[PDB]
Structures are given as C-alpha cells and as structure tokens.
Design an enzyme around this catalytic site. Sequence first.
Site, PDB file in Angstrom:
ATOM      1  N   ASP B  25       0.865  -1.265   0.178  1.00 20.52           N
ATOM      2  CA  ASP B  25      -0.064   0.017   0.068  1.00 20.52           C
ATOM      3  C   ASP B  25       0.958   1.398  -0.010  1.00 20.52           C
ATOM      4  OD1 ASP B  25      -1.944   1.718   0.302  1.00 20.52           O
ATOM      5  OD2 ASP B  25      -2.551   1.141   2.188  1.00 20.52           O
ATOM      6  N   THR B  26       0.776   1.747  -1.190  1.00 18.36           N
ATOM      7  CA  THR B  26       1.651   3.089  -1.344  1.00 18.36           C
ATOM      8  C   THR B  26       0.841   4.548  -0.642  1.00 18.36           C
ATOM      9  OG1 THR B  26       0.539   3.687  -3.258  1.00 18.36           O
ATOM     10  CG2 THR B  26       2.776   2.435  -3.416  1.00 18.36           C
ATOM     11  N   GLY B  27      -0.416   4.213  -0.265  1.00 22.09           N
ATOM     12  CA  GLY B  27      -1.212   5.118   0.546  1.00 22.09           C
ATOM     13  C   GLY B  27      -1.159   5.209   1.913  1.00 22.09           C
TER      14      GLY B  27
HETATM   15  C1  PI6 Z   1      -2.858   1.385   7.507  1.00 16.96           C
HETATM   16  C2  PI6 Z   1      -3.432   2.478   6.667  1.00 16.96           C
HETATM   17  C3  PI6 Z   1      -2.602   3.796   6.918  1.00 16.96           C
HETATM   18  C4  PI6 Z   1      -2.269   3.846   8.321  1.00 16.96           C
HETATM   19  C5  PI6 Z   1      -3.403   5.033   6.505  1.00 16.96           C
HETATM   20  N1  PI6 Z   1      -3.700   5.125   5.193  1.00 16.96           N
HETATM   21  C6  PI6 Z   1      -4.598   4.473   4.020  1.00 16.96           C
HETATM   22  O1  PI6 Z   1      -5.522   3.847   4.857  1.00 16.96           O
HETATM   23  C7  PI6 Z   1      -4.746   4.616   2.753  1.00 16.96           C
HETATM   24  N2  PI6 Z   1      -4.999   3.327   2.036  1.00 16.96           N
HETATM   25  C8  PI6 Z   1      -6.225   2.481   2.084  1.00 16.96           C
HETATM   26  C9  PI6 Z   1      -5.829   0.910   2.215  1.00 16.96           C
HETATM   27  O2  PI6 Z   1      -4.857   0.937   3.373  1.00 16.96           O
HETATM   28  C10 PI6 Z   1      -6.916   0.391   2.556  1.00 16.96           C
HETATM   29  C11 PI6 Z   1      -6.770  -0.998   2.616  1.00 16.96           C
HETATM   30  C12 PI6 Z   1      -7.964  -1.756   3.132  1.00 16.96           C
HETATM   31  C13 PI6 Z   1      -8.625  -2.808   2.254  1.00 16.96           C
HETATM   32  C14 PI6 Z   1      -9.429  -3.395   2.481  1.00 16.96           C
HETATM   33  C15 PI6 Z   1     -10.072  -3.354   3.862  1.00 16.96           C
HETATM   34  C16 PI6 Z   1      -9.544  -2.497   4.783  1.00 16.96           C
HETATM   35  C17 PI6 Z   1      -8.280  -1.792   4.323  1.00 16.96           C
HETATM   36  N3  PI6 Z   1      -7.854   0.424   1.357  1.00 16.96           N
HETATM   37  C18 PI6 Z   1      -8.947   1.323   1.365  1.00 16.96           C
HETATM   38  O3  PI6 Z   1      -9.377   1.950   2.389  1.00 16.96           O
HETATM   39  O4  PI6 Z   1      -9.881   1.303   0.314  1.00 16.96           O
HETATM   40  C19 PI6 Z   1     -10.743   2.329   0.104  1.00 16.96           C
HETATM   41  C20 PI6 Z   1     -10.055   3.658   0.346  1.00 16.96           C
HETATM   42  C21 PI6 Z   1     -11.687   2.116  -1.124  1.00 16.96           C
HETATM   43  C22 PI6 Z   1     -11.830   2.092   1.169  1.00 16.96           C
HETATM   44  C23 PI6 Z   1      -5.556   5.748   2.373  1.00 16.96           C
HETATM   45  C24 PI6 Z   1      -5.716   6.874   3.310  1.00 16.96           C
HETATM   46  C25 PI6 Z   1      -4.413   7.876   3.342  1.00 16.96           C
HETATM   47  C26 PI6 Z   1      -4.290   8.769   4.246  1.00 16.96           C
HETATM   48  C27 PI6 Z   1      -5.412   8.566   5.506  1.00 16.96           C
HETATM   49  C28 PI6 Z   1      -6.517   7.850   5.296  1.00 16.96           C
HETATM   50  C29 PI6 Z   1      -6.473   7.057   4.460  1.00 16.96           C
HETATM   51  O5  PI6 Z   1      -5.240   9.659   6.519  1.00 16.96           O
HETATM   52  C30 PI6 Z   1      -3.807  10.090   6.833  1.00 16.96           C
HETATM   53  C31 PI6 Z   1      -3.386   9.329   8.046  1.00 16.96           C
HETATM   54  C32 PI6 Z   1      -2.512   8.470   7.686  1.00 16.96           C
HETATM   55  N4  PI6 Z   1      -3.326   7.207   7.445  1.00 16.96           N
HETATM   56  C33 PI6 Z   1      -2.786   6.179   6.689  1.00 16.96           C
HETATM   57  O6  PI6 Z   1      -1.341   6.295   6.136  1.00 16.96           O
END
Ligand code: PI6
Lengths: 99, 99
Positions: B25-27
């Site tokens: 996950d690059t995000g």
């Molecule tokens: C473990 C994830 C990580 C901690 C978090 N990043 C993320 O969660 C980023 N990638 C999303 C991915 O980590 C998740 C993985 C997943 C897949 C299936 C079931 C559950 C989770 N995919 C996901 O959320 O897909 C969506 C957006 C379509 C609902 C998106 C993002 C970026 C910044 C955010 C909030 C959200 O807010 C900024 C604060 C920092 N958050 C992060 O860096």
Amino acid sequence: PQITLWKRPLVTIRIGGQLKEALLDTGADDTVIEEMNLPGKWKPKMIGGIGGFIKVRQYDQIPVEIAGHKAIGTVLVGPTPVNIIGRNLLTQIGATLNF
Amino acid sequence: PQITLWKRPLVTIRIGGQLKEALLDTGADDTVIEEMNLPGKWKPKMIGGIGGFIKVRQYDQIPVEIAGHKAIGTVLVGPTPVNIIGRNLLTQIGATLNF
Ligand SMILES: CC[C@H](C)[C@@H]1NC(=O)[C@@H](NC[C@@H](O)[C@H](Cc2ccccc2)NC(=O)OC(C)(C)C)Cc2ccc(cc2)OCCCNC1=O
C-alpha cells in the site's frame, strides 16, 4: 514518471474542471474524493477501510486527469481526509509497482 | 519484479518467524499487521484510515522480509482485516510507482 515513496505519492489531478491534490493508493480498490459537486447523477453507496465503513456518492464514467494522463471511470465522493486515486483509475494509466 | 494493479498487490512476507500475505500500500504511511503475539516492548498508538481510527501496538526494529527482500522497521499490530505494508518498509526494498 517514476515516483519514489520517501514522501506520500501526492500528484495534481483535474476533476470536474477543478484542480486537486490526490494520493496514488495501490491499497485502494476504488477512487475516493472529498465532498464536491460533480455533474451527472449519483447513487448512494457504502465502502469500508481501516477504521470502518462510510457512506459515499457513486459517480460513474467521470473523466479524471492524473498528471496529464487521462482516465474515465467510477469516482466515489465522501468524507475522507485525503483524495485517493485507487486501482480502478491507476490501471487505466498503466501504473505498476516496481522493485 | 513488476506488479500490475489489475488485482490487489498481495505478496508473501515473513515476520516473527511466520509467513503471511500482505498488501503493498503506497497510500499507507505505516505498516499494519493483523493481531499477533510478537515479543518485546510496545507503545500504544492510534492510526486513522477511511472510516476512522483504530488502536494499535507499536513495535520498533522488527525485521520483515518482503518478497525475499529484507527490511526492518516499525510495525503496528492491531485489528486490521488485511496486513498492510506501508511506505516505511516499501522504501527499504526500493519500491517505486511507475506510469
Ligand atoms: C493502514 C493504513 C494507513 C495507516 C493509512 N492510509 C490508508 O488507509 C490509505 N490506503 C487505504 C488502504 O490502506 C485500504 C486497505 C484496506 C483494504 C480492504 C479493507 C480494509 C483496508 N483501502 C481502502 O481504504 O480502500 C478504500 C479507500 C477504497 C476504502 C488511504 C488513506 C490515506 C491517508 C489517510 C487515510 C486513508 O489519512 C492520513 C493519516 C495516515 N493514514 C494512513 O496512512
């Protein structure tokens, strides 16, 4: 271009004639954009990630320009901290992971 | 290797002597692993995703092998549906986004 991951992979996108910053997210199946007005009809939908499920508006066949590259697909509008470009659009511009 | 985004970029990782399937996950700023009993001292932490925040346990200097590539860094353990390899470890294996 080749983007390293020392910093968040944020790029400028153009959607609905408006410029915005978005995160290139390979962990996201879909593209989720912050609350904004987009032309055309929308359908209510629910998606879930790390901290739970949220309600979003689903807009289909929306043209989005990512770093000059064109893509036309589904865009979800809802309460998100950052604009997320998911795999549905990343595949359209031929984005790949390399190491 | 080169990974396309037609499907979720899932790869095998080795952590604490166990093999697991994890999502590149690059995000993701951090690396989040499904609930597991790792020895050592930890610090409480709250991370946010789409939907909200979850409570996790922060472990430092954890050696993780990603697709045969050695890395070592901070790993967060908590209630996550999928194991997530974030930028903190991706940068260590020379991973880049290309389009
Ligand atoms: C473990 C994830 C990580 C901690 C978090 N990043 C993320 O969660 C980023 N990638 C999303 C991915 O980590 C998740 C993985 C997943 C897949 C299936 C079931 C559950 C989770 N995919 C996901 O959320 O897909 C969506 C957006 C379509 C609902 C998106 C993002 C970026 C910044 C955010 C909030 C959200 O807010 C900024 C604060 C920092 N958050 C992060 O860096």
